[PDB]
């Protein structure tokens, strides 16, 4: 871009280039889905998605209250989310199985399936990530008021 640098890109809307702190190798990040991929990547009316939610609290209620179901911190929740992403990408675990096993959403019962929806129904961050995903693609950690999600667009 600058006179002393190689020129470059497209990067469809939402994408940006970055560097691996570990290898110095370039990779691409989508700031809407928060997904990362090595390959240069280079909207629809309804989409169907499945997700895995990891809740966290920051609440701090008085002694009189019953113990809360969710006690982990946001940091701990993000660590769990990143670990699941790694296991799914490495083919070590299947998205559906992990969702059924660890998702804190009531949809865990349906292997994480939320069904088909249009814009206006889901929390904005979730909605934006879902519609920016390609069919069959998975998001990176997505933050909403419900907690941290991993989203898989199935349709």
């Amino acid at each position: 871009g600058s006179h002393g640098m190689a020129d470059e890109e497209k990067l469809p809307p939402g994408w940006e280039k970055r560097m691996s702190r570990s290898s110095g190798r370039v990779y691409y990040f989508n700031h809407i889905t928060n997904a990362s991929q090595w390959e240069r990547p280079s909207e629809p009316a309804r989409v169907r998605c499945s997700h895995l939610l990891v809740k966290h609290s920051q609440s701090r209620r008085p002694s009189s209250w019953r113990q809360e179901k969710i006690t982990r911190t946001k940091e701990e929740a993000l660590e769990l989310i990143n670990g699941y992403i790694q296991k799914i990408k490495s083919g070590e675990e299947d998205f559906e199985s992990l969702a059924s096993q660890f998702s804190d959403c009531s949809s865990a019962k349906a292997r994480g399936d939320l069904g088909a929806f249009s814009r206006g129904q889901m929390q904005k961050p979730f909605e934006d990530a879902s519609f920016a995903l390609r069919t069959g693609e998975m998001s990176g950690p997505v933050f909403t008021d419900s907690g941290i999600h991993i989203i898989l667009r199935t349709e």
């Binding site: 691996s20 990779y27 990362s36 991929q37 992403i85 990408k89 990176g140």
Partner: peptide, 7 residues
């Protein structure tokens, strides 16, 4: 949010 490398 600082992103994690793809692998």
């Amino acid at each position: 949010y600082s992103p994690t490398s793809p692998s």
